Amino acid sequence: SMEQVAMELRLTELTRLLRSVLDQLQDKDPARIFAQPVSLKEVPDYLDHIKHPMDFATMRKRLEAQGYKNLHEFEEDFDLIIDNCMKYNARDTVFYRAAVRLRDQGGVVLRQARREVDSIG
Numbered sequence: 119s120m121e122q123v124a125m126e127l128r129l130t131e132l133t134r135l136l137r138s139v140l141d142q143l144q145d146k147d148p149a150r151i152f153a154q155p156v157s158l159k160e161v162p163d164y165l166d167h168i169k170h171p172m173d174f175a176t177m178r179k180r181l182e183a184q185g186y187k188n189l190h191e192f193e194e195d196f197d198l199i200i201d202n203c204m205k206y207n208a209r210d211t212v213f214y215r216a217a218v219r220l221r222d223q224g225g226v227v228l229r230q231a232r233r234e235v236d237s238i239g
Contacts, residue, residue, distance in 0.1 A: 132235070133184050136192050139231045140181060143196060144174050146223040151216045152199050156206075167206050172198035189235045193228065200224075 147153065155173045156164050164171065177195050179185075186192045203217040 129184050136181055136186055139227060140177060142227045143224045146220050149216060151213060168202045170198055189232060
């Protein structure tokens with residue numbers, strides 16, 4: 119149908135906006151601490167601690183499959199990155215500190231993304 123197409127064009131445009139958002143959030147991680155999944159070869163007990171792992175490469179796969187229906191779903195995954203790290207790692211670690219800085223700096227980007235998503239519809 120014409121409606122299904124219009125729907126698909128909306129999703130494609132949302133995907134375009136979320137790709138830009140993801141690139142902006144990932145720039146706030148210049149150390150690349152959050153770029154890839156925590157390695158289960160190197161942290162073999164990780165899944166005993168963290169039940170829903172997340173990272174930027176995994177979000178990017180979902181994004182490119184147009185797997186985010188709305189900004190809320192995207193934000194859920196970004197929050198998993200931060201929250202998983204803040205649980206697994208102690209306060210006095212470069213990892214925890216990196217997550218705090220990513221959260222703080224990402225807030226600005228996500229604030230305007232919500233306005234753009236509502237605005238453009």
